[PDB]
Symmetry: C3
Subunit: 145 residues, 3 copies
């Protein structure tokens, strides 16, 4: 095909900047288009089978409902590895849910599915600041064949 | 800020009652407000960096779509660590999805996003009994700075 | 009860064809009804407590929003363990989301919740080919008591 056609709202192309393998799992640090950084955690088995290595090109795939949005950390530090700061670009409201797209510094867009109550409570609006919070274990990797 | 403002429908404050670290991951057992217990699984790296320890205060964050609802286990035992029993308090139906809030014994409320077909099939209604089923690996932790 | 009543759209009965335990986690390979294969990853603790073994009957539970749909891999290989190919049987559109059901070869049906934009972009329609992509870590297991 011309590309990979997958339902996930967020499919990023990038280059591995680091590969950190343990005996069970491996942490893959990816440098995205705009300069944004995204970490993924995959099994050791996958790191070997996909032939991962620093410097190789990969795709990182994150479904919309897996992305949490945060506006005020209030000093808290979280266990999720990926905290990407950006500005709200688009909100489309559904019945219970809504789709929010943030623009990150560098130009990458990330899409989150949250409740319409969350949009309301967070005060989201075009231009508002917010961070996308993604567990590295919720990032699926792809490698070209 | 006055608090942490995050999209997740479920943000619980609690105290760590146990910390169980292995070489890869760590199990964090949290005692919530009402007496409810919730287990989270985080990387070893996070357990060290966040300075986790039994007796310390934490926040546990669970997105709505990550909570499954069960009414009849029919004798089955599941691999998910958190099975919290409660009574239905609120259901708001959307187009395909719905938001269900359960009250747990002690007073904590938990919110789940499920399909409207699931609500129908389960026979959910105010006062019905049901359990929230949450994998401990789907619980994100926060620690005050 | 007559069965297990749980919200997840996908609850499959099967027999364990392989059990692969490591020091942290265990991979459980399940042979489903129609001949379809599904892999689950659970803690070692659960594999021991549930008394898992090859040849035993289990239930595998996957929430709808945890299933990604793919139509053209374009040569890419992914880190998710489960790539199940099938044909679209039913789509019900909501406001922002939609529910897609695929029929797999053998007769098993799998349901995915994706955005209505994904349905549009993928060109989904009754009879179209598509694969369900599920991380083995997003499969919850149940064992009869
Ligand atoms: O696969 Mo989706 O359309 O990001 O939920
Ligand atoms: O609003 Mo709908 O999911
Ligand atoms: O971040 Mo949510 O999906 O409003 O619980
Ligand atoms: O628990 Mo679900 O989101 O109705 O598959």
């Amino acid at each position: 095909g011309s590309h990979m056609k997958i339902s996930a709202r967020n499919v990023f192309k990038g280059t591995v900047s680091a590969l950190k393998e343990g005996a069970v799992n491996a942490e893959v640090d990816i440098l995205l288009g705009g300069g944004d950084k995204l970490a993924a955690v995959v099994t050791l088995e996958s790191a070997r089978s996909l032939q991962l290595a620093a410097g190789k090109e990969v795709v990182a795939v994150v479904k919309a409902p897996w992305v949490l949005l945060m506006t005020d950390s209030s000093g808290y530090r979280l266990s999720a590895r990926n905290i990407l700061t950006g500005t709200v670009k688009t909100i489309e409201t559904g019945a219970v849910n809504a789709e929010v797209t943030l623009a990150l510094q560098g130009g990458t867009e990330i899409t989150s599915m949250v409740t319409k109550e969350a949009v309301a409570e967070l005060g989201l609006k075009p231009g508002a600041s917010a961070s996308a919070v993604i567990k590295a274990s919720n990032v699926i990797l792809g490698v070209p064949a």
